[PDB]
Design an enzyme around this catalytic site. Structure first.
Site: not given
Ligand SMILES: [K+]
Ligand SMILES: [K+]
Ligand SMILES: [Zn+2]
Lengths: 5, 362
Positions: B129, B164, B166
């Site tokens: 991220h 993942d 996300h």
């Protein structure tokens, strides 16, 4: 802006 | 023989990450308890230099992270500008811990460049991220981006695959304008769910248009349907893009039992995706990521290390430092929850058709 967490 | 990036001191640093305390030790301990380290080449990680980190991150962000990291100043007023706060607290030492993780992934990538191995593993990496100028989503430095930039020294087409829970927004953003790196993320996509990006219509920008691939998925998906989606997308991507190296992020926050309680996967389903990629026989960088049931995350990445080694593991959790974390049943297998799969086949089919349309331009 998001919170994860 | 796979390279395994490891040192006791490296694992101890990774143990101090605020949202996953002790997870790195638990993962390594279980891998060691199954003696898998004896079938891998253990390589100590080199720490990333400031110059290494600044190939992606801005000097202003790096300087702020260094400043608040010195004493663990989690009350600095400028932290919110740089993404620090609740998700990413200014834990004392975090700048050096992040540089260690970034350096470990770079070391993995360098092992691949040099032909030392065909698979290099950093289970403490995958912090996908982080943006050039902002911490985000428990990620302070984007070691995945750093690893891809290192592979770019040799490989003209890098496929990043992100499993993942996300969306891998930081990696996709880093490479959004280029066709040298194709990013492919399967993730939960639902308004309000972090980070909020990664719809199937997000395909990258400019010269990178159609070189970003997103598979938006709803709560409750299980092994069989996930593998069907993943194999379908990766088959098309491989044919269209012809990658020469792969970076694979395997965040275990998809796994049944995670407190995020979104997907309903087991390590077997992820392992089938991994096997499909390993069958390409390309240089492959293996990363961790999310995973907030710590014992289940160790179960998962231990099982996947076995998959990498072609080894079938015993169901019984062997005795080791964290044995009691695996009670009361003390087995490696994870059982899916009895809750619904919210993924309708017609919606999944349209997503796959949209992606195939996108990939025709590639
Ligand atoms: K993902
Ligand atoms: K791209
Ligand atoms: Zn995650």
């Amino acid at each position: 802006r998001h919170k994860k967490x | 023989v796979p390279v395994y990036i490891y040192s006791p001191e490296y694992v101890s640093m990774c143990d101090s990450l605020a949202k996953i305390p002790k997870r790195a030790s638990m993962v390594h301990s279980l891998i060691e308890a199954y003696a898998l380290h004896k079938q891998m080449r253990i390589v100590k990680p080199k720490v990333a230099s400031m110059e290494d980190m600044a190939t992606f991150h801005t000097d202003a962000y790096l300087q702020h992270l260094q400043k608040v990291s010195q004493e663990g100043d989690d009350d600095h007023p400028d932290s919110i500008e740089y993404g620090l706060g609740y998700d990413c607290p200014a834990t004392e030492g975090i700048f050096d811990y992040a540089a260690a993780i970034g350096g470990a992934t770079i070391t993995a990538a360098q092992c691949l460049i040099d032909g030392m191995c065909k698979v290099a593993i950093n289970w403490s990496g995958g912090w996908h991220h982080a943006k050039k100028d902002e911490a985000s989503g428990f990620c302070y430095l984007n070691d995945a981006v750093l690893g891809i930039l290192r592979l770019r020294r040799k490989f003209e087409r890098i496929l990043y695959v992100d499993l993942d829970l996300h969306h891998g927004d930081g990696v996709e953003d880093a490479f959004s304008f280029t066709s040298k790196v194709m990013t492919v993320s399967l993730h939960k996509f639902s308004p309000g769910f972090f980070p909020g990006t990664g719809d199937v219509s997000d395909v990258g920008l400019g010269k990178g248009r159609y070189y970003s691939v997103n598979v938006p998925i709803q709560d409750g998906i299980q092994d069989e349907k996930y593998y069907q989606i993943c194999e379908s997308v990766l088959k098309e991507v491989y044919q269209a893009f012809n990658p020469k190296a792969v970076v694979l992020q395997l965040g275990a926050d998809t796994i049944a039992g995670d407190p995020m309680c979104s997907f309903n996967m087991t390590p077997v389903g992820i392992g089938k995706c991994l096997k499909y990629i390993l069958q390409w026989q390309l240089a492959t960088l293996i990363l961790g990521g999310g995973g907030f049931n710590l014992a289940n995350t160790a179960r998962c990445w231990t099982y996947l290390t076995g998959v990498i080694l072609g080894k079938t593991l015993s169901s019984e959790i062997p005795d080791h430092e964290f044995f009691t974390a695996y009670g009361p049943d003390y087995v490696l297998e994870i059982t899916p929850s009895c809750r619904p799969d919210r993924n309708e086949p017609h919606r999944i089919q349209q997503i796959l058709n949209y992606i195939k349309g996108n990939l025709k331009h590639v």
